[PDB]
């Protein structure tokens, strides 16, 4: 039922899997020209929840539909278990021949852990002969095509070590657990009478942090199930269905949100729904400046730079590391990010801090371009020992000059107050230091539109009130603004069940005048 | 898994390149007793029956073993082959392991002949979970009769982690070092893996290919040769994604794009310190690099290959920013190929191999003394000296006296402070009147050469072609006192101004841009 249309996000995995597995089986005479000798053993491995067997079934559909030029047999290495001496043994030679009498073919082996476990002194002589003669079945009945052994498992070490030898089972395909999620939401709701809004589904996928595929459909089914709970609360404690129209179970804005809150669900995090219209301008500005310094976000017509470096400096309480920098990291996605802070350096024992400080830089060198994050450099410099500072400096210096790896750091004290070793590390004469500024008047004006007023009247003079709140908030930092918002929004809850107005507005207007934060 | 592995008949000593002295000595231990059974009984010989392979991974450690197994099994069918890998769900678990080893040796004696191959012994017999296994292993290996006919072959990546009771003649008597191949062996490997190809590349093409590949080991060559073909195939037929096998041949521009898409094995785990001087900066420092190697032959006359040398030392001193320890030193290390290098730096003493820093220093000193000639490399000595405790300073200073006088071990060091500034103990190692101290410096011509094919040609890919010369003179005059980091920055700030004007077909709206930028640029 799936022909590469119920798969979301896997734009690059498909190209690799088809080119090195199916195409050599789809076009075997081509590789006779150069003698590539493609491997005869392939695997699907990764964390659970990646949907490994469905890909094999899709390959079966692709190969079977047509002229039957390449085939596929579906097999499981966990239901192929026979409690007899050698009866499950014939399954592979017949299968490696049944798929060979009608070759080419791809044979899937789900959970080979049971059919071919680790033969040992505790395992049955049955399974001992099974595994021995079984590896004899595969390494002997291969090496000329056109059978490519594809298997799946949850753990890589759950395989008999004699299987993974030269000239035997070799290849491994990494399946991992957000760009896939838009495609997933598009696909899995292909036939829905209450078709949700595209922004509705995008918010759904945004709020489904940590889910991998199956639970993505599970939440949708659960949302429908609780929709018929909420629209029809009388389903409990009622007689047989007498009059129920099964069309008012339509999913609206609040249905999935009440559905999401009924189960438990990196230094990059976008702003909240309340914070976005306050710092979005500054995030865009810093992104633009970074574009200017860092062009990656002999021969010409190729981007090049000289040691990408940048420092965020702002007065404490300006949210330069509390809200800005993780947001910038989130905005500059599709690049590897690697932090270096105290709980990641001292948070693991059985290792010297020097032992991990080299691994991050080495592996970020491997995957250039990469991002290294060092928050609160003004305090991180005074916690490490004398050797760590020197090791950090030498590791940073050993980078190539034209390597497009960016150093991102944030600070609280002004640049002129830092230790001198930091000072002769940034080039303020260049574009390497960015300043954070207080929000302007429009942002503060638009920060209070929702509560004043789009929900208070939900079942004048307050406008003067409104401007007074702004008339005092010219020079308050982010934390004071947000705490003020929370304290005002509390009173709105305080009189939910008071239809009579002019008494709640009195208490709001007297609390705002009473709010002293000098 | 005691069954022999069905090896291909295509590996018959014709797929091994540059390993000739090793094969020339291996065949007189295995083959000759069997093929000349009368000459070993002329008087008495009893040839040996065991050898160790040690060295970095990826140097054809197993390929020679498979080739030996196949080539031997030709006139004495069948020579048995047994393949076991160390640390394979068998260690740290007793007492099944001794039963397994005894069974393997019994069946091997039953076969007669056989070749037993223990791979990665480092995890089997470490330097009564572990005592009982090593004891029975060595008792069994001593219980082998002299004529055998059992030959035991061990492989490892580090020699330091083996029992000292095994390296005795009678168990593991002869040791073999498998180092990286040099340029000649690299060309030989290229010729071997490109044998069944009808568009045979030219010899000069192979020479330049061999020169363009440094720090590579066997598998890198295989991957590059196997993926350049896929690059050509991908480029030829993009409409097929019946097929025509007529024009899928490989050409240039396919080898270099192949070079782009992965990293060498040396940048993965080996982490070699020597790194080739960049093509952008080459015409700025090539003369200096050639000059240093000229002054290196005064003290270490092995570099021009009864060569007698006495304590070869060298130290290149300069200003903080002249690129001593950033560009020059890895280049000089690079040009001295065929000499093994061992590194002594902060990341190596401390991060890797978390034991006392007192151990790795002794290990690298002894290993360097064992395989002379070699280079011991300790850069940034004015910072290295002030991080270590007095114990390691004493250890290091005393280990440099135990080398024999005429042993060819070169010490390479770099520094930023002037000679008289360094602490007096370090000063009591370099004897400048002997010629052990080099001073580095920053000409008009060399930077002129650095600039013209950026400010003339790359900016000409309507053009005035007159004020470019004046701009070149102005900027060159302006750059009379910058250091290397600054000088290589102006190149990156002008080319970016060019990139920002990619589609500007009029090359006049940008001229004033540079004629203002170079005056708004400051050191
Ligand atoms: N990434 C995914 N995309 C789509 N459907 C998925 C995904 N992951 C899981 N599913 C669905 O949930 C089911 C559970 O997956 P499955 O049990 O095969 O994986 P597993 O956790 O490795 O377990 P096991 O190997 O024991 O079967 C799948 O059969 C499929 O219906
Ligand atoms: N000299 C060589 N000639 C041809 N191939 C080589 C050579 N050295 C290494 N290889 C490649 O390396 C692989 C074997 O590496 P191996 O010697 O097993 O390294 P290790 O023993 O450290 O795993 C082979 O697949 C082969 O293609």
Residue A48 in marked binding region: yes
Is B219 close to ligand 2, i.e. is its CB under 6 Å away? yes
Q: What is the DSSP string of B294-317?
A: HHHTTT-GGGG--------EEEEE
Size of interface A-B (CB pairs under 8 A): 102
- Chain A residues touching residue B85 (CB < 8 angstroms): 161
Instruction: With H, G, I as helix, E, B as strand and everything else as coil, classify residue A408.
Output: strand
Q: Is the dihedral of CA A384, A389, A390, A395 positive or negative?
A: positive
- Chain B residues touching residue A33 (CB < 8 angstroms): 245, 248
Cβ neighbors of A386 (< 8 A, separation 6 or more) are: B387
Burial state string for B96-112 with b = 16 or more CB within 10 A and e = fewer than 16:
ebbeebeebbeebeebe
Resolution in A: 3.8
Distance CA B454, CA B72 (A): 61
Q: How far is CA B286 from CA B295, B339, B414, in A?
A: 15, 21, 18
Residue from A118, A77, A116 nearest A95 by CA = A77
Composition of chain B by helix, strand, coil, percent to 5: 45, 10, 45
Instruction: With CB atoms and an 8 Å threshold, state whether A34 touches B96.
Output: no
Of B229, B351, B493, Cβ closest to residue A34: B229
- Chain B residues touching residue A132 (CB < 8 angstroms): 1
Atom 21, ligand 1: which residue's CA is nearest? A48
Q: Which of A390, A392, A403, A428 to mutate to test the interface with B (most CBs of B within 10 A)?
A: A390
Q: Is the dihedral of CA B3, B4, B6, B7 positive or negative?
A: positive
- Chain B residues touching residue A397 (CB < 8 angstroms): 326
Q: Which of A353, A391, A395, A429 to mutate to test the interface with B (most CBs of B within 10 A)?
A: A391
Q: Please report which ligand is nearest the Cα atom of A170.
A: 2
Is B213 close to ligand 2, i.e. is its CB under 6 Å away? no
Tokens of residue B403, six digits: 């080398």
Distance CA A352, CA A349 (A): 8
Q: What is the CB neighbour count within 10 angstroms for residue A153?
A: 20
Residue of A nearest to B387 (CA): A387
> Residue B475 belongs to what H/E stretch?
helix B467-478
Residue B369 CA from chain centroid, whole number = 18
Cβ neighbors of A373 (< 8 A, separation 6 or more) are: A267, A325, A329, A337, A338, A339, A340, A341, A408, A409
Answer yes or no: are the C-beta atoms of B102 and B22 closer than 8 Å. Answer: no
Answer yes or no: are the C-beta atoms of A161 and A31 closer than 8 Å. Answer: no
Q: What is the DSSP string of B429-468?
A: T--GGGS-EEE----HHHHHHHHHHHHTSGGG-----SHH
- Chain B residues touching residue A166 (CB < 8 angstroms): 5, 62
- Chain A residues touching residue B493 (CB < 8 angstroms): 306
Angle between helices A504-514 and A478-494 (to 10 degrees): 160
Cβ neighbors of B68 (< 8 A, separation 6 or more) are: B26, B30, B115
Answer yes or no: are the C-beta atoms of A168 and A41 closer than 8 Å. Answer: yes
Backbone angle region of B229, left / alpha / beta, with phi > 0 → left and psi within -120 to 50 → alpha = alpha
Is B225 close to ligand 2, i.e. is its CB under 6 Å away? no
Report which ligand 2 atom has the smallest distance to the Cα of B185.
1
Q: Which of A119, A300, A399 to mutate to test the interface with B (most CBs of B within 10 A)?
A: A300
Is B61 close to ligand 2, i.e. is its CB under 6 Å away? yes
> Residue A174 belongs to what H/E stretch?
strand A173-174
Answer yes or no: are the C-beta atoms of B175 and B25 closer than 8 Å. Answer: no
Residue from B58, B172, B169 nearest B125 by CA = B172
Distance CA A59, CA A491 (A): 60
Q: What is the CB neighbour count within 10 angstroms for residue A488?
A: 17
Report which ligand 2 atom has the smallest distance to the Cα of B18.
1
Chain breaks in chain A (C to N over 2.5 A) after: 177, 265, 297, 459
Burial group, residue B249, by CB count within 10 angstroms (0-12, 13-18, 19+) = middle
Instruction: With CB atoms and an 8 Å threshold, state whether B83 touches A27.
Output: no
Quote the ligand 2 centre to B185 CA distance (angstroms): 14
Quote the ligand 2 centre to A379 CA distance (angstroms): 49
Quote the ligand 1 centre to A155 CA distance (angstroms): 15
Q: Which of B228, B235, B347, B392 to mutate to test the interface with A (most CBs of A within 10 A)?
A: B347
Q: How far is CA A309 from CA A153, A371, A403, A431, B82, in A?
A: 43, 11, 12, 9, 56
Instruction: With CB atoms and an 8 Å threshold, state whether A30 touches B233.
Output: yes
Angle between helices B131-142 and B96-111 (to 10 degrees): 20
Answer yes or no: are the C-beta atoms of B306 and B340 closer than 8 Å. Answer: no
Distance CA B412, CA B444 (A): 30
Distance CA A371, CA A366 (A): 12
Distance CA A15, CA A180 (A): 16
Residue A465 CA from chain centroid, whole number = 44
Residue of B nearest to A131 (CA): B1
Quote the ligand 1 centre to A212 CA distance (angstroms): 9
Distance CA A96, CA A138 (A): 8
Distance CA B82, CA A490 (A): 77
Distance CA A91, CA A75 (A): 10
Quote the ligand 1 centre to A43 CA distance (angstroms): 16
Q: How far is CA A487 from CA A46, A465, A477, A514, in A?
A: 47, 15, 16, 12
Quote the ligand 2 centre to B216 CA distance (angstroms): 11
Distance CA B168, CA B141 (A): 11
Q: How far is CA A442 from CA A279, A319, A474, A484, in A?
A: 12, 19, 11, 18
Cβ neighbors of A389 (< 8 A, separation 6 or more) are: A381, A421
What does the angle CA A332 – CA A336 – CA A342 come to, to the nearest 5 degrees? 100
Atom 4, ligand 2: which residue's CA is nearest? B218
Tokens of residue A252, six digits: 């609206």
Strands, DSSP E only, in B5-91?
Answer: 50-54, 80-85
Answer yes or no: are the C-beta atoms of A148 and A26 closer than 8 Å. Answer: no
Cβ neighbors of A147 (< 8 A, separation 6 or more) are: A40, A96, A99, A100, A103, A104, A105, A106, A107, A141
- Describe the strand order of the beta sheet including A147-152 as a list of residue ranges: A71-76, A105-110, A147-152, A41-45, A173-174
* Binding-site positions of B for ATP: 55-62
Distance from CA of B258 to the nearest CA of A (A): 15
Instruction: With CB atoms and an 8 Å threshold, state whether A120 touches B522.
Output: no
Distance CA A283, CA A270 (A): 10
Quote the ligand 2 centre to B162 CA distance (angstroms): 23
Residue of A nearest to B90 (CA): A120
Atom 10, ligand 2: which residue's CA is nearest? B218
Atom 28, ligand 1: which residue's CA is nearest? A51
Residues written for chain B: 523
Distance CA B146, CA A368 (A): 56
């Amino acid at each position: 039922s799936v022909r590469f249309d119920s798969v979301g996000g896997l734009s690059n995995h498909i190209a690799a899997l088809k080119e090195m597995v199916v195409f050599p089986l789809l076009y075997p005479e081509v590789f006779e020209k150069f003698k590539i000798q493609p491997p005869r053993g392939c695997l699907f491995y990764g964390p659970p929840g990646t949907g490994k067997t469905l890909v094999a079934r899709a390959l079966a559909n692709e190969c079977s539909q047509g002229d039957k030029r390449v085939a596929f047999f579906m097999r499981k290495g966990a239901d192929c278990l026979s409690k007899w001496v050698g009866e499950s043994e014939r399954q592979l030679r017949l299968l490696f021949d049944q798929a060979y009498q009608m070759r080419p073919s791809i044979i899937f082996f789900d959970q080979i852990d049971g059919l071919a476990p680790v033969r040992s002194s505790r395992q049955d002589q049955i399974h001992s002969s099974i595994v021995s003669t079984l590896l004899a079945l595969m390494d002997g009945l291969d090496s000329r095509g056109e059978i490519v052994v594809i298997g799946a498992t949850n753990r890589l070490d759950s395989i008999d070590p004699a299987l993974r030898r030269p000239g035997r089972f070799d290849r491994e395909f990494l399946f991992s657990l957000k760009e896939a999620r838009k495609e997933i939401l598009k696909i899995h709701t292909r036939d829905w009478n209450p078709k949700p809004l595209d922004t509705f589904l995008e918010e759904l996928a945004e709020n489904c942090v940590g889910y991998c595929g199956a639970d993505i459909k599970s939440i949708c089914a659960e949302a429908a199930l609780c929709a018929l709970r909420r629209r029809y609360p009388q389903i409990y404690t009622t007689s047989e269905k007498l009059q129920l129209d099964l069309s008012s179970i339509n999913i609206s804005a609040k249905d999935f949100e009440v559905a999401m809150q009924k189960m438990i669900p990196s230094p990059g995090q976008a702003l909240s729904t309340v914070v976005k219209p306050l710092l979005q301008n500054t995030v865009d500005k810093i992104l633009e400046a970074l574009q200017r310094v860092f062009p990656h976000a002999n021969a010409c017509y190729q981007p090049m730079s000289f040691r990408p470096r940048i420092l965020i400096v702002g007065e404490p309480g300006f949210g330069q590391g509390s809200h800005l920098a993780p947001a910038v990291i989130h905005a500059l996605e599709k690049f590897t990010v690697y932090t270096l802070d105290i709980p990641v350096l001292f948070g693991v024992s059985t290792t010297s801090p020097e032992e991990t400080c080299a691994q991050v830089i080495r592996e970020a060198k491997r995957t250039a371009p990469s991002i290294v994050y060092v928050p609160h450099i003004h305090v991180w410099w005074e916690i490490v020992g004398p050797t760590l500072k020197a090791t950090f400096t030498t590791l940073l210096q050993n980078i190539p000059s034209f390597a497009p790896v960016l150093l991102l750091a944030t600070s609280d004290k002004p640049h002129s107050a830092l230790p001198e070793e930091v000072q002769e590390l940034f080039i303020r004469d260049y574009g390497e230091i960015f300043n954070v500024q207080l929000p302007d008047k429009e942002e503060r004006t638009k920060f209070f539109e929702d509560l004043i007023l789009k929900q208070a009247a939900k079942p004048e003079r307050l406008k003067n009130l409104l401007k007074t709140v702004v008339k005092k908030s010219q020079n308050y930092n982010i934390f004071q603004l947000e705490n003020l918002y929370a304290v005002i929004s509390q009173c709105i809850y305080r009189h939910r069940k008071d239809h009579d107005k002019t008494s709640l507005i009195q208490k709001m207007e007297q609390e705002v005048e009473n709010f002293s934060c000098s």
